[PDB]
Amino acid sequence: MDLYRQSLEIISRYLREQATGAKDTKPMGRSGATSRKALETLRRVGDGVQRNHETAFQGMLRKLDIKNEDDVKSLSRVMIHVFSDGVTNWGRVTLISFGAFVAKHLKTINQESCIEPLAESITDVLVRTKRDWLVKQRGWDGFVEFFHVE
Numbered sequence: 001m002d003l004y005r006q007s008l009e010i011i012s013r014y015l016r017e018q019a020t021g022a023k024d025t026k027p028m029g030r031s032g033a034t035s036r037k038a039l040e041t042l043r044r045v046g047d048g049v050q051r052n053h054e055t056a057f058q059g060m061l062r063k064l065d066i067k068n069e070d071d072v073k074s075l076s077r078v079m080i081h082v083f084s085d086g087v088t089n090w091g092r093v094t095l096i097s098f099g100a101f102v103a104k105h106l107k108t109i110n111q112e113s114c115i116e117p118l119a120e121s122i123t124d125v126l127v128r129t130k131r132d133w134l135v136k137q138r139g140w141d142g143f144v145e146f147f148h149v150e
């Protein structure tokens with residue numbers, strides 16, 4: 001729940017700002033500096049993943065044919081099915097970036113009400129299936145470190 005609330009805040013913020021185009025700047029709950037830095041790496045890396053995977057993401061999004069809230073709920077079984085199954089690494093992030101891509105689509109089709117639930121679906125899939133890996137990787141500090149550039 002420590003890692004969950006922190007992941008939910010980062011993923012939820014990232015998804016909301018990708019959708020609306022407006023950066024939400026208000027609190028720094030659950031390891032404040034780590035979350036600010038996680039959110040920063042996520043918007044640099046996440047935007048790169050969407051840029052470099054526009055064709056795949058557009059293809060997949062069209063295939064998914066998300067029209068309403070119930071279509072967003074149906075996404076979770078595919079999400080769990082694909083996201084687990086094999087090897088886990090920071091690159092596999094693509095999960096969040098694809099989520100941000102879907103969140104953008106959701107704003108476009110007047111389904112902004114599904115962005116927060118989608119963020120919760122992604123966090124549930126991420127934290128509940130990979131907690132042990134995440135804690136061993138020092139959580140979001142690990143994500144920040146792995147993607148640290150300069």
Ligand SMILES: Cc1ccc(-c2ccc(C(=O)O)c(NS(=O)(=O)c3ccc(Oc4ccccc4)cc3)c2)c2ccccc12
Nearest residue numbers: 060061063064075078079082083092094095096098099102
């Ligand atoms: C809302 C939402 C966020 C993130 C994922 C997700 C999960 C795992 C991976 C992964 O690779 O572990 C991933 N990365 S992906 O390459 O974008 C991708 C790879 C395979 C997919 O399956 C299809 C299923 C159906 C249609 C086309 C493709 C889709 C995307 C992204 C979602 C995956 C599925 C649905 C919603 C999702």
